Ligand binder design. Sequence first.
Ligand SMILES: Nc1nc2c(ncn2[C@@H]2O[C@@H]3COP(=O)(O)O[C@H]4[C@@H](O)[C@H](n5cnc6c(=O)[nH]c(N)nc65)O[C@@H]4COP(=O)(O)O[C@H]3[C@H]2O)c(=O)[nH]1
Ligand SMILES: Nc1nc2c(ncn2[C@@H]2O[C@@H]3COP(=O)(O)O[C@H]4[C@@H](O)[C@H](n5cnc6c(=O)[nH]c(N)nc65)O[C@@H]4COP(=O)(O)O[C@H]3[C@H]2O)c(=O)[nH]1
Length: 131
Amino acid sequence: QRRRYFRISAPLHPPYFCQTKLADNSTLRFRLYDLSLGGMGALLETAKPAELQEGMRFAQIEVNMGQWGVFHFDAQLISISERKVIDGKNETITTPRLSFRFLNVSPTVERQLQRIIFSLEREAREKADKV
Ligand SMILES: Nc1nc2c(ncn2[C@@H]2O[C@@H]3COP(=O)(O)O[C@H]4[C@@H](O)[C@H](n5cnc6c(=O)[nH]c(N)nc65)O[C@@H]4COP(=O)(O)O[C@H]3[C@H]2O)c(=O)[nH]1
Ligand SMILES: Nc1nc2c(ncn2[C@@H]2O[C@@H]3COP(=O)(O)O[C@H]4[C@@H](O)[C@H](n5cnc6c(=O)[nH]c(N)nc65)O[C@@H]4COP(=O)(O)O[C@H]3[C@H]2O)c(=O)[nH]1
């Protein structure tokens, strides 16, 4: 059991979007992939900007969970990897996968993270709730 916490997968069909500012003052946007009490995974839209790389620390990333609310978390970018899917044209499409570790997780921050996690479990149980 290498992972300390259970990670809940987010729906990409109705994707949830996050964003944060870079040192060059540009905005970075990415789709929420999965979430846990320890961090989160996300998918980039474009190819990774040169500025983006592992080790960067972010203050109050805006995670917009739709009806469930908007949240802001500190996090450290731990790893940039590749997510691959098979095209509708039967082509392999590579896009950057981000792995974050949450920082400064006060007792109230994890309060919020559990709120989001249960909402995602209830939701995904409705995704499978329909044959
Ligand atoms: N540094 C760092 N990078 C992370 C972390 N979590 C995810 N990543 C990166 O994101 C890639 C895809 O993660 P995944 O969707 O959970 O997909 C994972 C997951 O489904 C499974 N897997 C790998 N390790 C574990 C594990 O320790 N526990 C569990 N339950 N599953 C694992 O194998 C798949 C491929 O694993 P990878 O080749 O390692 O590829 C991983 C890795 O490069 C992390 O905590 N730290
Ligand atoms: N939801 C989510 N959280 C993320 C992701 N990336 C990092 N984190 C969070 O950051 C914590 C520390 O990551 P680490 O230093 O790379 O240290 C990680 C990493 O070295 C290894 N590990 C776990 N899962 C994977 C994986 O899927 N791939 C690889 N390569 N390593 C993994 O186990 C260590 C501890 O794992 P955790 O207890 O889960 O604790 C992880 C996790 O809570 C992510 O993509 N999604």
